Amino acid sequence: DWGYDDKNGPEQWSKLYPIANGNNQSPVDIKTSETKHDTSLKPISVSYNPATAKEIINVGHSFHVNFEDNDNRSVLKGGPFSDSYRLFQFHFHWGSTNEHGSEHTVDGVKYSAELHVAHWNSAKYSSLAEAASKADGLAVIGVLMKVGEANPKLQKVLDALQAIKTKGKRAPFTNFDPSTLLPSSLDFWTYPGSLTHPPLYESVTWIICKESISVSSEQLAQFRSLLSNVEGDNAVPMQHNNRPTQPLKGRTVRASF
Numbered sequence: 352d353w354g355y356d357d358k359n360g361p362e363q364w365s366k367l368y369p370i371a372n373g374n375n376q377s378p379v380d381i382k383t384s385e386t387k388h389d390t391s392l393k394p395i396s397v398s399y400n401p402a403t404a405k406e407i408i409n410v411g412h413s414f415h416v417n418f419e420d421n422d423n424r425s426v427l428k429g430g431p432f433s434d435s436y437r438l439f440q441f442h443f444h445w446g447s448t449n450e451h452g453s454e455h456t457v458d459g460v461k462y463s464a465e466l467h468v469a470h471w472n473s474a475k476y477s478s479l480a481e482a483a484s485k486a487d488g489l490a491v492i493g494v495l496m497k498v499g500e501a502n503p504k505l506q507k508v509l510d511a512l513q514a515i516k517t518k519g520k521r522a523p524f525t526n527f528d529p530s531t532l533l534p535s536s537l538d539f540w541t542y543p544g545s546l547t548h549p550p551l552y553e554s555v556t557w558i559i560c561k562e563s564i565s566v567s568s569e570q571l572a573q574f575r576s577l578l579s580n581v582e583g584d585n586a587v588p589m590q591h592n593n594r595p596t597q598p599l600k601g602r603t604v605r606a607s608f
């Protein structure tokens with residue numbers, strides 16, 4: 352099984368998942384002197400229905416908030432896309448201390464955490480499982496989280512963690528619109544990339560917001576106090592789950608601004 356420790360972590364993923372050394376891997380460092388402004392990029396449009404929120408799950412290396420994805424109640428449109436993409440999940444990545452924790456970096460700068468809002472191409476495919484391995488199958492919005500003031504918009508998420516403290520626990524998580532977590536401006540960078548952990552499919556069009564959102568040192572501590580072990584075993588806090596940045600291999604990061 353893969354993870355983030357020294358024996359099963361990102362530097363070893365290539366043994367079971369050779370795509371880890373591929374040409375479209377994520378995350379990346381966005382060098383702003385090398386980005387290309389593309390006037391053809393449209394604004395990002397998100398329209399999410401809070402009734403699609405379903406469940407929060409401790410998946411061992413992280414926690415996931417999942418959404419009902421049987422129809423187009425919650426969709427992402429615009430940006431580089433001609434297809435509509437259906438929301439299915441959001442989750443976070445974080446690091447061992449405040450000085451790192453984001454997955455993407457901007458001009459070498461590491462942030463404290465990163466929010467991922469993930470969608471699948473329902474115009475072309477019939478399910479997440481079909482879409483997840485297709486080059487145009489997934490769209491993920493990344494938001495860099497800068498340590499500073501406590502972010503009240505995270506409250507429902509943080510309040511839910513006490514009920515999913517150990518691996519495999521899950522609980523209803525309803526009536527929540529994750530567009531409330533996005534920054535005020537949706538100016539973005541986009542590039543073709545991958546899932547940031549196994550199976551590492553090169554199926555993701557990334558949308559990285561220029562504006563960060565805030566998170567406090569104590570809110571990050573709540574993430575790190577989640578446990579990767581099953582109930583009854585020795586407690587193993589989820590200290591970190593961010594992958595190092597990967598080579599661009601000639602890809603172009605486009606800017607909407």
Ligand SMILES: NS(=O)(=O)c1ccc(NC(=O)NCCNCc2ccc(Br)cc2O)cc1
Pocket residue numbers: 467468469479480481483491545546547548549550555
């Ligand atoms: N950090 S991230 O880059 O935003 C990120 C990382 C991982 C994921 N993973 C995901 O969504 N689904 C798992 C793989 N697809 C389902 C699948 C796989 C194999 C078989 Br067999 C059947 C299946 O249904 C999403 C976003």
Ligand SMILES: [Zn+2]
Pocket residue numbers: 442443444467547
């Ligand atoms: Zn992620």
